[PDB]
Structure formats: C-alpha cells, structure tokens
Design a protein around this ligand. Structure first.
Ligand SMILES: [Zn+2]
Ligand SMILES: [Zn+2]
Lengths: 148, 108, 82, 85, 99, 94, 99, 83, 109, 93
DNA sequence: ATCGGATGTATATATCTGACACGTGCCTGGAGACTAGGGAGTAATCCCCTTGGCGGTTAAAACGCGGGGGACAGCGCGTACGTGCGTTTAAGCGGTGCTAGAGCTGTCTACGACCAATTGAGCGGCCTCGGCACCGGGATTCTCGAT
DNA sequence: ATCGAGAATCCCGGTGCCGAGGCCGCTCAATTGGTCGTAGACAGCTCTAGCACCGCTTAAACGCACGTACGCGCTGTCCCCCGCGTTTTAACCGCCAAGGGGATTACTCCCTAGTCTCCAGGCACGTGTCAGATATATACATCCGAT
C-alpha cells in the first residue's frame, strides 16, 4: 500500500549512497523487518566493535515510528541488557520527515557521547559520572568479548 | 508504550499525568479512579491551553508586541465563535471590551 | 465611621463607563439609578465575602473570598487566584 | 521567479506536490500527507515541530487549506507529472 | 470665531478612546471607602487585602459596562439615542436581576 | 521560607514555546491561564463524577471523561478535544 | 343587527381564561412526532418513554410562555401593543441566550 | 421511517394560545415563524444532551430521567418527573 | 437527651436522621462526616417542607379543596417573596402561571 | 423487585402537622420529593466545597450552618439556622 | 348618562368513578457495643503586610454659559389583524397483538487501592539584560464653516 | 457636488528601568515492585411496555369576508445635554512607623470509621369509599348600540 512506496524509496536511497560505518537491509521476505549493522565510532571506547540490531516497521508508516532493538549486548547508559534504547527521536520526537538513515546516524552518535540527563540505566550512568577511567575500562572489557 | 520512563512522555503530553491523577483521586470525586482518566483529562487541558495560547500569540503579534498580556487574551477569546461560547460568564481582569459602535450612532 | 460615600462615584466616572459601553448620549437621571444598582451589587457580593471570611475564623477579607463569592453568584473572575 | 523541480518536492512522500498546503512556519507539503498527519499523528509540522491546531481548525472549515498560487504555478510549469501522479 | 465641534462628534471620540484602553475608570480611594463602609455595615472591625478591593473594583466595572451595553440596546430599540432610567429598569428586569 | 504552592506555570510555558517559539508571556497572563486550567479541570471532573453517580458506578474511567467533554464543550472543540484524548490513550497503553 | 364584540375584548377574555388553567396548549401527537424527528436526526433507531416526551413538552411550553412574557414587555416598552419579531430577538439577546 | 417538516404541526392557534397565556393581546403576523425557529433550537439543544446521556448508559430508549438531567444541566430544573 | 429512643425522635424531628447520615456519607462529599451534621440538615429540610406545605394548604383551602395539587404549590411558591427567589429557575409541572394583565392593555375608561 | 426510597411518609407527617384536614395527591408528592432532593444536593455540595476550601476533611454542623446562610435568602436563612441549632441542642443532650 | 338586548360567566344539585388513604407480610437497612488511630483543637512564636500620617503637585471634578439637536406631542392615512361563520382535517379514545429491550441474577477474572524504599522533577530564591514605557518632534487625517 | 484652517492622532528615534527568564540547591511526592479483596463484564432468563394497526367521533384547524384601530410617517415646539473655559478640590505618589493578625510547629485526646450482631421500620401489594369531575338548569355581571 502507501507505506510500501516509502520503503522502496528508503531502500533505494540507502543503496545508492550508503552511509558511513553502518549498513541496513531487508532481513526477511517482507519489507517490514530489517537487519542493520553498525561499526564503532573512531573517537570512542568502542574501538573495533561491530554491532547488530533489528528494525521493526509498524503497519502504520511513516506516521508511526519504527522500533529498533540491539541484537547483541552493549555497555551504554542509554541501553539495557535486552537492547532497549532511550532515544527521543524514536519515541518522544518522531516526525514523518525523519528517515531510517537519520535515526541510525543518531544511534551511532549516541556511542560517541552517552546522554546522562535521562539515562535508561541509572547505575552505570552514575558510574560514568563518577570516573571516566572506570567507565572506559568496563566498556572495553565488555566490547572485546561481546562485540568481537 | 514501553515503561521505565515518566508517564507524561509515554502519552506524548506536556501536562503532568501524575499530578492530574493525584488531584482526581484526592478531590472527593469518586471512590476509585481509572488508569486512563488522567491521561484523557490532561490531553484535553493541554489542547485547550494550546488553542488559546496560539490565538493570543497571533493577537499579540498583530499589536507589534512580543509578550502576551491579558488584553491579547481577551481579544483572542472574544473573537472566536467557540471559545467565547465556552468562556461566556468568565471575566478576564484588565481585558477591556471589543470595539463596537452601533450603526445608528454614527454620523450621517 | 463613614457616611455618604456613594457620591464618590461621580458623574465623569459614570460617563466614562457609558462611553466604554458604547453610549453616545446620556440623560440626567442615569447617575442616581447607576449608583443605586452599583450599591445593590456591591452589597450582594460583600455579604457572601464576609460570610466566607467569618466561616474561616479570620479578621481580614482576602481576595480569594471575593473570588469565591463572585464564582458563587455566576461572575467568575480570572487573574486574582483560583 | 520559478522554483526548480529539486525544491518542488514533498518531503514526506518524496513525490510531486499535489494540492500543496503551506503551514504558518513556511513549510509546504502536499494535501494527502497533511491530512494523514492530522488524522493519524500528533498534529504538528513534520519538519520543525510547530503545532498548528488552531490554524488547522480555522482553515479546514473554509476549505482554504490548499495554497492556490503555488499550486497554479506547479500545475502550469509541470503539467506532465500531475496526470501520472 | 473660536472653533467648536458639533454636538456628538466628541462623544464618539471618547467611545473609540475608552474602548481601546484597559485601565480602571472609577477612582481608587472613593471606591475603597464605599467598600469599607458597606463591609462595616455588615461586620464591624474588618480588614481588607488590597487584592480584594481590586477584585471588587474589576467585577463592579465589568458589570456596569455590560449593563450599559444592554441599556444602550434597549434605548436604540425604542427609536432613541439617549439612555433613560426605564431602559436600565427594563434591561435589569429581562436579565432577571429584579423580575 | 514560604510553603510550596503548585501551579501549571511550567507546563503552560512549555506549551507556549511550541505554538510560538519566539513569544514571551507576562505574569498576569500566566495567572489567568492557571485559573482557566483550574476552572476547566473542576468542570470536567465534576460532570464526570455526577455522570458516574447516575449509573451507580464507583469508578471514573476514560469513558466518563470522554462523555463529560462531549457534554460541556461547544461543537467543534468537542469534536477535536475528544480525538486528542483518544490518541493519547492509544499512545499510553501501547 | 347581528351582535359582535369590538376587537380587543375577546383577546382579554382568552388571556384571562388561559392564565387560570394548567393544561398543555400544544397537541400531543405533532409534538411527539417533531421530537422523534429531531432525535432521529441526532441518533438513529431511538425509542422514547412517554414520560420523556411529556417532560419535553412541559419544558418547551414553559420556556415559550416566559419568552412571550419578555416579548410583551419589550413591545410595551416601544409604545405599542403588537409583538413583532424584533421584540423576540431583543428579549433573546438581553437574556443572553444568543448574545 | 423518516419524517419531514413536522414543525408545521405547531399550528398558529397553538402559538396564539401560548401567547395568551403569556399575556399578549395583539399579535403580529410574522411571530409564528420566529417562534417555530426558537422552539426548534431549544428542542435540538435539549435532545442532544438527552441522547448523549442515553448513549453513555448503553441503552436504546431515552428515559424521563435523562431529559430531567439534561434540563438541569442546561440550567432549567424541572419538578414532577423524578430526581 | 435520653439516649434511649430513635435518633429522629431524640432530635425532635420527623425526617430521618439515619438516612440523611447515610446519604451524606455515601454521596462523595467528604472523607469524614460529623455526628451533628445530619441533625442540622434534617431540621433545615423539615422546616422548608413545613413552610411550603402550609402555604400550599392555605392556597388549596382558598379554592374550596382538601387536596394540594401542583397548581396550589405553584401559587404558594410564586405568591411568596423569599420562596420565589429560592426557586426562581425551577419549573413546576402542571403549575400554570400567575394571572396578571398589564395596565396598558386594559380597555380605556 | 427493587425497593425505591422516598420522603413521602415524612412529608405526609409534616402535612398532618400543619394542616390536619387537607390531603395531598400523587403529583404534589412527587414535586415535594424533587424539591427535598434538590435542596439536599445544594446544601451538601456547598458544605463540601466549604470544607475543601478551608483545608478540612470533615463536614460538621458549622459547615451546614454557613452553607444554609449562603444559599437561603435572609429571613428563610435565619429561621432555618434557628431550627437547626434548636435540633442540634435538643439532640446532643 | 342610562336604557334594552344579548352573551358569557358563576352558582346550585344529582351521581358515579377511580385515585387516595390505610392495613398486612417481611426483609434489608438502621441501631447498639467495642476498638484504634489520625484529625483537629490548643498553646507559642515569627514577621508580613495593613493601617495611619504628612507634604507636594497636578490631573481631574465642579461650575457656568451659549445653543443646537433630539425628545415628545398632535394628525392623517391605510393597511394589517381581530371577529365571526362554514368546511374540512386529523387528534383523541378504545381495543388488540408482538416483541425489543430494560431489569435482575450468578461466575469470576482482571483492574485498582495500600504499603515501603528511592530519587529526580519542580518549587523557592538570586541575578541580569532586553522589551516596553515615556518624551519630543514631525507627518497624516477627520472636522467644519464657507463657498 | 468642494478648498482651506484649526485640531486630534499616528510614526519615528533616543533613553532608561524593572521584571521575565534562566540557573542553583534541596526536599517530598511520584515511581517501582508486590499483594489482595472486589467490581463490573459477560452470559442467561423474565416480563413490561413501546410500537404498530384499525374504526369512530367530533373537536380543533382552515379559509374567507368585513371592518376598524393602530402603526408609521410627517411637522412643529421647546428644553436640556453637549462642548468649552475657569476655578476649586482632593487623588496620587513617596516616605516613615507601629503592631495585628496570618501563617507555621508541636503535643495530645477524643471522635469517627470499621466490624459484628440483631430486629423493626418502611416498602410492595391489595382493597374500600368518597372528593371531585361532569351534566343540567338558573342568576347575574358585562359589553354594545342608541338615545
Ligand atoms: Zn506528500
Ligand atoms: Zn514547519
């Protein structure tokens, strides 16, 4: 139906000019389910890591936001163990003009600097606010075993 | 909506769902209060506030001012068919009256 | 003690109120009738205000008592509380 | 002047403007997209998030939602795409 | 030789002037004295917050302006332009204030 | 210090910064807005209470608030306001 | 030779007769049909209790009687005895029904 | 089972009787249409609230209590039918 | 008082004090209800009912009848001053209206 | 069936107090029932609002007295206050 | 100023019918005794804002005057509405038949009140810089007596 | 139909001030997790009254004709508000000083909610009889034309 044309336009625009360090595609036969992979940003404690996530398109698109969930495990103040992400673009301030490229870029930029104003995991956010060295060490310890 | 966040953000509102729930529950309105009532009431209140604020902002812009004063509120309320009907008996302090001179009184 | 303060509502004040109300020409007996009706309205409001104050075991008539009285009579006022 | 085809594109459906309505924030989108967002979303501008609830109410009862000048210019300079759209 | 306006063209000027402003038209001190007199008639040895007096003044002025609008309509109905006490009485009776 | 008094000033300013991102508001206008919000809250919550009492119920649900909004809002406003509330509920459960 | 009353006596006779009785002055079937038509306009497939229709008729008749009293006062104000639509409109406006 | 222009059932003699009860001696010829319009407006306003009340209770027949509640909400209390 | 008879009889009234207490408690007015409020409310209601019934009985006796009908109630309410103000917005079913004719409409002498 | 409560018998008792000879029809009883219910609702609502304003949580006799003063006109309010005070004094001892 | 028709309303008498007043069975709601805890009364203290006064200066009110426009009364016209009579229409009453839907009852499952620990949203207080108020000069526009 | 002089109002530029908006600290109320008693959702059955139709009166509605009296326009008189100038009065603003009462806190006690048991007061149902409505026949008030 109508959302389908938006999906083909999204896929074409992603294929012609792929973004940096990320790549998304249709995991299944239907166009609703997508799989995406992201490479750790260069100026971050996630060096060398590659991460997988799933994108679920609602039956009502683009006027309702999609839902993204991390497949792997990540040590970040804004992400739980099950992959839930606390991003205002996905829930609080979603607009139809936004594209999956923008939300993926925002997710990538989250790893550059975590948001401590509204952390989804208060404890590790408080740990990060305590000392940067301990947060860096624990993030590296998690990523050399989970990401790779 | 997924939990583990403030109630006013799950519904997408700006008005406080929790305060409205407390006022409904402690206001001697009913023995019990449903879980969806505060959300509905807060949404309605926010809609009305946004409507009147937009009309008052237009009225203030028409007067070259960048600050809403009660005169602009009166102008916005009394120039609308429905808000005037809703706020019929309500008196706005220092709001004045709309300019209206009867056609008979004008010079011929 | 005070006496005969209704004459403080002078002729120019009533003329100004009429002009704001959209009146082009005023007769000469309007002023006494206006003073009488204003006095009746003030008595009606102040009676309820004083009753509200007396119930609260107070000695000052707060603005909120006036707001409550006006709301009771059907003259809701915005700006002074509530 | 004449707007180019690059800037004559609806941002939501990525197609040519069809009865383009212009919001008070000077953002223009085609009528089906605007109606869909009004009836199915938060009733704001999808580009800069400025709610137009009172404006939408006041202009939906007079059928003045659609901008006429821009629509005429689009229909005159680009008549080919409208038929297939 | 001195310039004088025709009777009626200064009244409309004041109508336009006073319908555009928002201040209070009755003086403060006489109204406060009248309110205090009525209150002491009701209960003796009372005190007033300034906001209470201001609220009373605003309510009284709004009521008087509305009554004058209705009185003007009543006067125009009878094919006149002056407002007379019978207009006020009829408006009050129809509004239900005295029946 | 003075005891804490609650008001809708912060939320009213947050809403104002949405319709007009470059327009301020005076203190007296906020005092009028807060009174208007309180008055409408009281009206709706009293009408819903009476409506629930009529049918011998004990709970104030979203249905009662919707019917109260239908009853005491004039015409088009109701047709819009109801809708908004509905959407909020639909966005709160899921 | 035939006897007939001057215009005005029969009107006062009817005024005295209808102010002493208490019955309903509108026939039941046409009012019931009008009420049912309006209700059908609002929501289709409705059934009406007889008490509901009777209450509606009583309320409507009382409202119309009060409106006609106010109309008569408005007409008498303008030095007349006939009541005209402008009297009804003025009575409705001053009462605040339509503002 | 639709109905058309039943407001003509409020005949001129009925309006004359209502005016006589109200205390009117001489009546113009254009009162009847204005009175019909006023009655139509009043009936619509009351019946809308009555139907809302009967819809909230998940019923299909309007009761006298719904009419009484609607009248009380509009500000016209009625005695003799309950409440 | 004796603290031995029924509550209404102890208070000296005929309106029910227990029913008024229950209606105040279950009516969603306040969290708590005092012990003397129902007595006051019942006394006020009984006084008002007695006044209206006495006036209606007088109006019915003036019409050579031994039964109060809504017409007598309407006459009693309207002919009074305080009661008419208290029930200004109230409509009495089958009550009619007070008879009056304006002086202008009367025939010329 | 279901039982419906009403003030019929008390109204009849008061009527027999004031006018031992006169009777009363059914419609008059319905009108008096409606009147009593309306006055009950008015006074109770005013008393509840008064208690809420003063940051209280109970409805005593003084709230009812002030509500009666606020609602009823002058002479009626004075007589009602006198009757209520008399009843409270007689009941409390 | 009455006088005689002529009409309509008020008054007295028989009668008969259905609605008001009272009696009975019972069951559900009100009364009586007991307990616990939280709400409200009472005493003490702080400090905020309400009252009272004095001096100046000046915007606003009171007084007086010329007169022009509007309120009010009187006449004439003619048309719309009141009154009465013959005709046609549909309301009102009675009686019967059918069933949709209001009303009550039994199960039970999911929604909402209560309780305890925790912490972040929002309220109180401070500070500053720009929006609005004010002043002074100039340009624009209704107004009116005279052509 | 208009030209021009006196007067009120709107624009524009410069200066100053105070309060609106943003930030910091903190306390308390909203959030989260779990438990448990109960309300209302739902299915089922009963039986009340709302709806539909038909036949017969006769009462209210309708249409038409005649006349008169009241609404409306027009003219005229006069008198009372209006616009303007001058003088008197007190409102408004800033300042100081006192203390009355509003607002907060702590302690305690007693008053009311909750529970259980018991029984009688009011509600539904049924029945008798007389208050009042109706029909019929006089008595009198009142309206209208004509002397
Ligand atoms: Zn589009
Ligand atoms: Zn925009």
């Amino acid at each position: 139906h109508m959302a389908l044309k938006r999906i083909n336009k999204e896929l074409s625009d992603l294929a012609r000019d792929p973004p940096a360090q990320i790549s998304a595609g249709p995991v299944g036969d239907d166009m609703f389910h997508w799989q995406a992979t992201i490479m750790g940003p260069n100026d971050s404690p996630y060096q060398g890591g590659v991460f997988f996530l799933t994108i679920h398109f609602p039956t009502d698109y683009p006027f309702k936001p999609p839902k993204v969930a991390f497949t792997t495990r990540i040590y970040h103040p804004n992400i739980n163990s099950n992959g839930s992400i606390c991003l205002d673009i996905l829930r609080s301030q979603w607009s139809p003009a936004l594209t999956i490229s923008k939300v993926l870029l925002s997710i990538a930029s989250l790893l550059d600097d975590p948001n401590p104003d509204d952390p989804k995991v208060p404890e590790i956010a408080r740990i990060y606010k305590t000392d940067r060295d301990k947060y860096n060490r624990i993030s590296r310890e998690w990523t050399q075993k989970y990401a790779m | 909506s997924a939990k583990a966040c403030t109630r006013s953000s799950r519904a997408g509102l700006q008005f406080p769902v929790g305060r409205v729930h407390r006022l409904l529950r402690k206001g001697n309105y009913s023995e019990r209060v449903g879980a969806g009532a505060p959300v509905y009431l807060a949404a309605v209140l926010e809609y009305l506030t946004a409507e009147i604020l937009e009309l008052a902002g237009n009225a203030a812009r028409d007067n070259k001012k960048t600050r809403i004063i009660p005169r602009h509120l009166q102008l916005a309320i009394r120039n609308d068919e429905e808000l005037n009907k809703l706020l019929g008996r309500v008196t706005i302090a220092q709001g004045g009256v709309l300019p209206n001179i009867q056609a008979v009184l004008l010079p011929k | 003690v005070l006496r005969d303060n209704i004459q403080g509502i002078t002729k120019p004040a009533i003329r100004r109120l009429a002009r704001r109300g959209g009146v082009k020409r005023i007769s000469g007996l309007i002023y006494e009738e206006t003073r009488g009706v204003l006095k009746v309205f003030l008595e009606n409001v102040i009676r309820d205000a004083v009753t509200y104050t007396e119930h609260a075991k107070r000695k000052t008539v707060t603005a909120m008592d006036v707001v409550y009285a006006l709301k009771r009579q059907g003259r809701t006022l915005y700006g002074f509380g509530g | 002047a004449i707007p180019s085809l690059s800037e004559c594109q609806c941002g939501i459906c990525m197609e040519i403007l069809v009865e383009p309505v212009t919001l008070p924030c000077n953002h223009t989108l085609c009528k089906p997209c605007f109606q869909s967002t009004v009836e199915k979303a938060s009733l704001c501008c999808p580009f800069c998030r400025r709610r137009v609830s009172s404006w939408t109410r006041y202009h939906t009862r007079r059928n003045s939602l659609v901008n006429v000048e821009l629509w005429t210019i689009i229909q005159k300079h680009y008549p080919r795409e409208c038929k297939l759209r | 030789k001195p310039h004088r306006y025709r009777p009626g063209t200064v009244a409309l000027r004041e109508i336009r002037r006073y319908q555009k402003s928002t201040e209070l038209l009755i003086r403060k001190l006489p109204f406060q004295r009248l309110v205090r007199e009525i209150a002491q008639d009701f209960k003796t040895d009372l005190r007033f917050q300034s906001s209470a007096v201001m609220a009373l003044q605003e309510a009284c002025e709004a009521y008087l302006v509305g009554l004058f609008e209705d009185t003007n309509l009543c006067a125009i109905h009878a094919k006149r332009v002056t407002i007379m006490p019978k207009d006020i009485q009829l408006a009050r009776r129809i509004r239900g204030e005295r029946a | 210090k003075r005891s804490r008094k609650e008001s809708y000033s912060i939320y009213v300013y947050k809403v104002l910064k949405q319709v007009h991102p470059d327009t301020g508001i005076s203190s007296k206008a906020m005092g009028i807005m807060n009174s208007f919000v309180n008055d409408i809250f009281e009206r709706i919550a009293g009408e819903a209470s009476r409506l629930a009492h009529y049918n011998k119920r004990s709970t104030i649900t979203s249905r009662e608030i919707q019917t109260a909004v239908r009853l005491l809002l004039p015409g088009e406003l109701a047709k819009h306001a109801v809708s908004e509330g509905t959407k909020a509920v639909t966005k709160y459960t899921s």
